[PDB]
Design a protein around this ligand. Structure first.
Ligand SMILES: */C=C/C1=C(C)C(=O)N/C1=C\C1=NC(=C\c2[nH]c(/C=C3/NC(=O)C(C=C)=C3C)c(C)c2CCC(=O)O)/C(CCC(=O)O)=C1C
Ligand SMILES: */C=C/C1=C(C)C(=O)N/C1=C\C1=NC(=C\c2[nH]c(/C=C3/NC(=O)C(C=C)=C3C)c(C)c2CCC(=O)O)/C(CCC(=O)O)=C1C
Lengths: 471, 469
């Protein structure tokens, strides 16, 4: 089936039957039988992988057969690399096992120093341990990545709870424009491409305008279903994503991944306006920056909600003094710097006890009237929140007999930073300007999400006004 | 002048002027002229350059003269490595520059070069990504080290405030004895050992019964003072620590350092009961772990107190509410899980106001009485604390001066083959040498405890002046 916009969602990009020509593939079964190969296995590998033939030291060499043989009898999913001369030019020979099949991949040797990488990994461990902000390691390491590799541009994305993603970091040649503060949707990265970005630390496209070197046979006879190139390194790129880059005028791609638990938290994307390829051992070197950042960013966000937790249980002890000192809360809760309006990031708030109604920062008495009416279907629902409806509402109930409530509200997510001052067939939706527009229709009517912590607190305050109201 | 127990605290082990046999050293200067060499240069490298000699292309080879030439052309601390054949075998050419002198060291190569170093790492730096408990991170990368390296035993040290170290993780083999919960004086690791352990992530001892392969000349002509070998990997070992390891039945060492800022926070100590050696590409696969791990111990500690604080200002909200919804300053402080009892880690606590007092966990009024009698010297003190004194650790604050409002938190005291120099060079001989260093003392008062006792005094200041109504 042809792959257009209505199909781009489900389009299998793991089983393309194709690869990139910068290397060759040979797929083997449980015993070592050649099930198929890229039609270019004789471009530089002087021999012919004939469907149904076998491995021979006269085609592949000692070290290769040696390695492969280790894998067919390998305990855990087999994966490894080997540098040995195959034919007349030198090769990087990397393989791996997936499902019940086996794969081999051959890269030519582009004629690094390790100490010179273990050295400026301290330029990054040091540089971010004075500064302690995830935004500044992303910002910092993003600069360092550019220097290490030479990529025309390199960006760092963060992925929100909606898998939307933003450009929170950038280093580019001043010859090019900027994409900082860019918000593209969850669509631009489909469930089956993102799943791949997690299974693979690094993904590398050597050339975008490349011609797909299909591997044949198309289907693997044992199963009669398309082979699964998920962990493949030369796997072909989606034809839709290709048109994207060549519109952006970008001709190469490499992506270090940041994985927290099981989420794609963010990744460093590196474009290059001309065909750029990096040797394999160098990409296993960056696969190391991958885990590092996923491990500092791990406890930065878990050492920064602990800060939010600190300053929100301080300004929640303050209202334990102010409120018992004078004795009717409508005072302490309206306090400017401490007190509810600031306690939980919002664009407004409301306090409701008895008949009195204190609307901090705006007239929210009318909305609160509706939110309590739709709380008559839910009696005994001492909490409520929503990102649509002034469409942000978070409400807790600290007193039942007398209407005892607290409201915080929000507006649509406002684009933090904006800017001001070559088309493809499949439409204009395939460009930066289009990605942004298609995000704007997703959040239309959607207020910033109530964060995991913005709700921990809401449930804490309600627990203080509980023992504070009663007595 | 020999080195005994008496000197060993000042032993200049950074300038030994000798190396471990398994490799060779060649000291150069700015312009690339040889200044010295180990006495085993010919045993290992086919050729023998002279004192004063220039680069002998015969000896080092093209790719290495390419490395040295970009090290002479450029300032600041230089660092790099190569692989090449020199003589019958081939080596790791591991060169650096410290101060103004150069050092080129050579180690055997017994092969995946750019894929072994990068393979070993993802194996252990993902051991740091897995837990949230800073005792788990230590218990685990200890076990994972044992497995990666086959070392007979590998330990994890946590260094305390006084610099005395504690063994907090261990995986030995069933034959060996346990060293878990062993405590040893800050002197076991002399001033310049604790320095080199910080300025150098990894330290490798090939053989403890080894015979030092002295480098000559012994005095650098340029300066007329011994060679400074701080950032060296084949530097000789102190005779005292050798005699210590052969007392323990140990001949092979390799330790990963943990530096949290400028302190030696702790380290992983790998032992082996028979000679052992780790390839250079695998030692750098650890030296990079050393840094990330210091980075993650960094956050796992600054996030562990940022949690203590959070639980402090929460149970400060417990008594603030309990004493303000009543007039019971005492009752509120008294509670089992809230208040002074469990606000700060203590073996006892005591609150005074007027002629009344209550002491949780014992009879502390007798001692507070004397802590006061001693504070009639400079009445102005609002905070006071030390670890010496009966119940030996006292943290005291004052919240109401007119009626002697005081708060106290108390702490008790901290819980056949032989050498040419004595028994004291043994695990048992060190556990006692620590039972003397910390006697009279008690668990120090952390930067955190103090920051809390302070927030609790202000907290009580405000609740007393608040009975103005
Ligand atoms: C509906 C399917 C897709 C559309 C539409 C599309 O544009 N790409 C689609 C599938 C894939 N996207 C893949 C990676 C990917 N896509 C984006 C989208 C962007 N949004 C932006 O605003 C910008 C730039 C300003 C981009 C590039 C990004 C950022 C990425 C990640 C890699 C990169 O940054 O270049 C993707 C993976 C392909 C592969 O490597 O196999 C597919 C498929
Ligand atoms: C005053 C000189 C020394 C005394 C006394 C001493 O005990 N060691 C002295 C010199 C050095 N020690 C060095 C490292 C070091 N020493 C210990 C001592 C231990 N105490 C214990 O209880 C145990 C085990 C149960 C030991 C091993 C330790 C732990 C270490 C750190 C390295 C390791 O764990 O192997 C030292 C550095 C030598 C070097 O490598 O240059 C010197 C010098």
């Amino acid at each position: 089936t042809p792959v257009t916009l209505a199909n781009c969602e489900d389009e299998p990009i793991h089983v393309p039957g194709a690869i990139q020509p910068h290397g060759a593939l040979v797929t083997l079964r449980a015993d070592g039988m050649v099930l198929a190969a890229s039609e270019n296995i004789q471009a530089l590998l002087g021999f012919v992988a004939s469907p149904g033939s076998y491995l021979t030291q006269e085609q592949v060499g000692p070290e290769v057969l040696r390695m492969l043989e280790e894998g067919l009898t390998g305990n855990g999913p087999w994966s490894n690399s080997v540098e040995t001369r195959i034919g007349e030019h030198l090769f990087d020979v990397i393989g791996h096992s997936y499902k019940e099949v086996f794969y081999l991949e051959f890269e030519i040797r582009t004629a690094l120093s390790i100490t010179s990488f273990t050295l400026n990994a301290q330029r990054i461990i040091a540089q971010v341990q004075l500064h302690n902000d995830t935004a500044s390691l992303l910002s910092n390491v993003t600069d360092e990545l550019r220097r290490m590799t030479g990529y025309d541009r390199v960006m760092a994305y963060r992925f929100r709870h909606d898998d939307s993603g933003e450009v929170v970091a950038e280093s580019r040649r001043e010859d090019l424009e900027s994409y900082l503060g860019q918000r593209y949707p969850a669509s631009d990265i489909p469930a089956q491409a993102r799943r791949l970005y997690i299974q693979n630390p690094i993904r590398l496209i050597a050339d975008v305008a490349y011609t797909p070197m299909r591997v044949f046979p198309a289907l693997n006879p044992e199963t009669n279903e398309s082979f699964d190139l998920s962990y493949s390194v030369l796997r072909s790129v989606s034809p839709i994503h290709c048109e994207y880059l060549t519109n952006m005028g970008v001709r190469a791609s490499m992506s270090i991944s940041i994985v927290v638990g099981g989420k794609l938290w963010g990744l460093f994307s590196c474009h290059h306006m001309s065909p750029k390829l990096i040797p394999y051992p160098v990409r296993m070197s960056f696969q190391i920056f991958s885990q590092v950042c996923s491990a500092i960013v791990e406890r930065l966000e878990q050492g920064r909600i602990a800060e939010l937790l600190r300053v929100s249980t301080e300004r929640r002890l303050a209202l334990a003094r102010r409120a018992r000192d004078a004795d009717d809360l409508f005072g302490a809760l309206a306090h400017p710097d401490d007190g509810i309006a600031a306690l939980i990031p919002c664009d407004g708030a409301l306090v409701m006890l008895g008949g009195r109604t204190l609307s901090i920062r705006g007239d929210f008495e009318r909305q609160a009237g509706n939110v309590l009416q739709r709380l008559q279907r839910d009696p005994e629902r001492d909490i409520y929140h929503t990102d649509n409806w002034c469409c942000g509402v978070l409400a807790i109930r600290f007193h039942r007999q007398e209407s005892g409530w607290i409201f915080w509200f929000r507006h649509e997510e406002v684009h933090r930073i904006r800017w001001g001052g070559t088309i493809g067939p499949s439409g204009p939706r395939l460009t930066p300007r289009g990605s942004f527009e298609a995000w704007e229709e997703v959040v239309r009517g959607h207020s910033t999400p109530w964060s995991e912590t913005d709700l921990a607190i809401a449930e804490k305050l309600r627990l203080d006004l509980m023992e504070l109201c009663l007595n």
